[PDB]
Design a protein around this ligand. Structure first.
Ligand SMILES: Nc1nc2c(ncn2[C@@H]2O[C@@H]3COP(=O)(O)O[C@H]3[C@H]2O)c(=O)[nH]1
Ligand SMILES: Nc1nc2c(ncn2[C@@H]2O[C@@H]3COP(=O)(O)O[C@H]3[C@H]2O)c(=O)[nH]1
Ligand SMILES: Nc1nc2c(ncn2[C@@H]2O[C@@H]3COP(=O)(O)O[C@H]3[C@H]2O)c(=O)[nH]1
Ligand SMILES: Nc1nc2c(ncn2[C@@H]2O[C@@H]3COP(=O)(O)O[C@H]3[C@H]2O)c(=O)[nH]1
Lengths: 258, 260
């Protein structure tokens, strides 16, 4: 789930993005995917008179040329030459076939390359798939599985993923609140101080699929307890208005008692 | 070269069901029409009884399904995701995205499915207009007469050429007939014959094949064909209208000054 990263100059990052936006087979990727491809590519060089791609071979890498010149042949027929700012080697990866042509260096070249597995991983990181994963998660939460699909979908549309370090206060008692939290990862501790000048008392531990932060949205806008990450925690979070329109009605949430 | 996909004859009602199911699927509705058609024709029938597991999450994906009758249940790690009825695609994610099955699919009743194998799906995914256009380009470049034409002109040729198929024995061109088209042979072979008068039998002139062309003479004189061109085996020509011929190919010395 975690991709390789290679640091690049803005000029390089722009060259690659423009190369992709110029390529007829890839120009319609979502922007976030282009961005991920951009950061993922690692640098590769070849000297003059080298063969980068042999037709018939297994394709593994997709290239963007930053510097140099290559010649593209197929069955001995010259197809074209390509200069900087062009993608090549994407067909074998996009279409799961062998290399459809041969690419040779005419000079020393400087390429950026991404391997097949990274590319395929990124191809699946679309808005529609992220949305679907949010839906699948929500359906796993008993409070929300029973909701109509349209409302789950509306929820999935607005859900924000936030992360908390161990010991981090997700919620402090006594402050206003504007967020409702669903735990997708890890555990939290809930504590409360009854009077001022006192140490907070432990109430309970919540984990994956549990939720919190409704009290300040239902009633007075003051947090009634502390919620502290007890390990590395991920929450799916909902702003006050979304809560009100989409979730505020639910009996299990509205009439929650402790 | 090219693979031939299997054809499975289906009722009109089924073909429409499949077509609609794809166009209703968010991961597939943006396929070209030609691709959706090809999927339609190459899906084959498969049935399952009540309480069968069609797809297990984690497995390598092989087939994409379209349901015509019945109801299936979709779960992931035991979480119920949905039920699906007729007119729905399932099993496309593993194949589209080269991952393992992302969920489990089980039947609730007897089901009637249409299925497409991964060999076909992979073939069809690559049959786009753009890929076809590029194949046209690569072919023209293999023909020395059309190689050295600028890229802009080859691209225009690919835009307007018509790929046409001919039966064995078919007169692609009859001597004496009016003509408006130029032909480039992309596949197969033709025989060229000519008769001195129409009350005489034609004599053999020559045999042409892939990368050869014909039909230029009637575009350069009065539009009358000066010989017969007859398909020998299965023949494919890239066919070019008169105006496109004049603007794009007519200039070429090899074509203009072709002598026989
Ligand atoms: N088949 C083909 N490839 C080309 C052409 N122009 C440059 N290329 C690149 O050369 C590459 C060969 O490896 P790939 O088939 O994976 O991807 C190809 C393209 O990205 C062309 O006109 N035809
Ligand atoms: N008042 C109270 N809040 C709790 C308890 N256990 C979990 N919580 C959560 O801790 C949260 C503090 O922020 P909110 O008061 O807005 O909403 C609260 C609840 O959702 C409990 O026993 N008492
Ligand atoms: N991951 C996922 N698959 C679903 C869902 N609804 C129905 N499906 C189908 O279940 C199938 C499992 O095999 P695939 O992962 O190949 O493709 C999947 C879909 O076509 C859903 O909400 N999530
Ligand atoms: N007149 C003539 N045409 C030929 C000969 N060999 C192949 N051809 C082709 O057959 C075609 C008949 O249609 P066209 O006269 O338009 O153009 C002709 C040529 O392109 C030949 O020896 N004589």
């Amino acid at each position: 789930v975690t991709l390789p990263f290679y640091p690049k100059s803005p000029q390089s990052k722009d060259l690659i993005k423009e190369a992709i936006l110029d390529n007829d087979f890839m120009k319609n990727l979502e922007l976030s995917q282009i961005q991920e491809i951009v950061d993922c590519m690692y640098p590769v060089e070849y000297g003059k008179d080298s063969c980068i791609i042999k037709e018939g071979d297994v394709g593994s890498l997709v290239y963007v040329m930053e510097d140099g010149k290559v010649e593209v042949t197929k069955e001995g027929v010259k197809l074209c030459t390509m200069g900087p700012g062009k993608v090549f080697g994407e067909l074998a990866i996009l279409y799961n076939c062998t290399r459809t042509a041969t690419v040779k260096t005419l000079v020393n070249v400087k390429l950026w390359a991404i391997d097949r597995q990274c590319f395929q991983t990124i191809m699946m990181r679309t808005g529609l798939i992220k949305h679907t994963e949010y839906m699948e998660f929500l359906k796993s939460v008993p409070t929300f599985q029973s909701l109509p699909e349209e409302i789950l979908s509306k929820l999935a549309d607005v859900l924000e993923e936030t992360h908390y370090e161990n010991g981090e206060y997700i919620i402090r008692q006594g402050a206003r609140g504007d967020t409702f939290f669903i735990i997708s990862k890890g555990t939290v501790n809930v504590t409360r101080e009854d009077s001022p000048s006192e140490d907070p008392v432990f109430l309970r531990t919540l984990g994956k699929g549990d939720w919190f932060g409704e009290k300040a949205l239902q009633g007075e806008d003051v947090r009634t307890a502390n919620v502290i990450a007890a390990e590395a925690v991920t929450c799916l979070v909902i702003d006050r208005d979304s809560f009100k329109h989409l979730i505020g009605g639910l009996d299990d949430v509205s009439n929650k008692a402790y």
